[PDB]
Amino acid sequence: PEMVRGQVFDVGPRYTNLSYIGEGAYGMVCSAYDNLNKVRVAIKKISTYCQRTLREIKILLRFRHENIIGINDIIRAPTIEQMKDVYIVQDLMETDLYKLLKTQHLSNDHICYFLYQILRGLKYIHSANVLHRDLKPSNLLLNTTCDLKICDFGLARVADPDHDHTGFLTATRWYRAPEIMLNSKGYTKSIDIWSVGCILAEMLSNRPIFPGKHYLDQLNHILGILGSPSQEDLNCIINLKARNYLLSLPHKNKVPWNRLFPNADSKALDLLDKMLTFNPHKRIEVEQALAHPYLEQYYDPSDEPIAEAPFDLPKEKLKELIFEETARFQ
Ligand SMILES: Nc1nc2[nH]cnc2c(=S)[nH]1
Numbered sequence: 440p441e442m443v444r445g446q447v448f449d450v451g452p453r454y455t456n457l458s459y460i461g462e463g464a465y466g467m468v469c470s471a472y473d474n475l476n477k478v479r480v481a482i483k484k485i486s487t488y489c490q491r492t493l494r495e496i497k498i499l500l501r502f503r504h505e506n507i508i509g510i511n512d513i514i515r516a517p518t519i520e521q522m523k524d525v526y527i528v529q530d531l532m533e534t535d536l537y538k539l540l541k542t543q544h545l546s547n548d549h550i551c552y553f554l555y556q557i558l559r560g561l562k563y564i565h566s567a568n569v570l571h572r573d574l575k576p577s578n579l580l581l582n583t584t585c586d587l588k589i590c591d592f593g594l595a596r597v598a599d600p601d602h603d604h605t606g607f608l609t610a611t612r613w614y615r616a617p618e619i620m621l622n623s624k625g626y627t628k629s630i631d632i633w634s635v636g637c638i639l640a641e642m643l644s645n646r647p648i649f650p651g652k653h654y655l656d657q658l659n660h661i662l663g664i665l666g667s668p669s670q671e672d673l674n675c676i677i678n679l680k681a682r683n684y685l686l687s688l689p690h691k692n693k694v695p696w697n698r699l700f701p702n703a704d705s706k707a708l709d710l711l712d713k714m715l716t717f718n719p720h721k722r723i724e725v726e727q728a729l730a731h732p733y734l735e736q737y738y739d740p741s742d743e744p745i746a747e748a749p750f751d752l753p754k755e756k757l758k759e760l761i762f763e764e765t766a767r768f769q
Pocket of ligand 1: 460463468481508529530531532533534580
């Protein structure tokens, strides 16, 4: 067994010369040489935590799309008794958008291209009636030619708008839609669109637009820029405790986008405005975002595929489910 930073990375004959890349969720990430098609790859070691592991495997194996990270191989023991670690193999990318925003100014041409590819991937995901629910810059991988792939489906769910309602004060904080702090479990597609709006804002300025320190700090940051919600938007919130909290706040005026981003393309600001809408019912959907004049140069519905079909247990059946789902790579 090759060892990496004091750890067993038992990835067999096929994958050699492992280099530490970092640690995402789940554990260690190394790159490795694949001797079957002579190209380096990324390998994640996996040791509840079982739930999100299973969820992701199940989704990523069903999805096939240029803008979604795939699964090339899965390595595990031949038997359930012997199975401890599971190794996930994926295409090696150069960087993620979070690391990129820390260090690099982006041209409008790059912002436009990135945003197109995010939406193109999201169009597919939503057509399968799946919510990602944790879109943020670190879950967006880029290769050396700026091709983009969405990763980490650990928090993903099937859409369920009939059961979205919940109480007041019930994923990553900065990219959370406002309705989540107010009356929503985040079971509708509109919460992903909000996260893309945040990512877009972050691409225009190299900084998180709403960096809340905590739950309600997040909300007052949003309202500090969007302004106090209208009576019509408030009427949509029927839970008295959410509504009366909002009514207890001082009046805030909308800060116009062109003041926050004085050198942004005006078309980008017009799309941003429609993504970061307080009322989820008024918020643009992904197909409409794709058709927006900002993305005209890329928009091509015949090259924007949709999925062919849309989508509580003891720890014993879960180990077993992971085993069964990973059998195809044996
Ligand atoms: N560079 C890099 N490439 C990847 N492919 C799948 N995951 C990764 C990560 S976390 N980093």
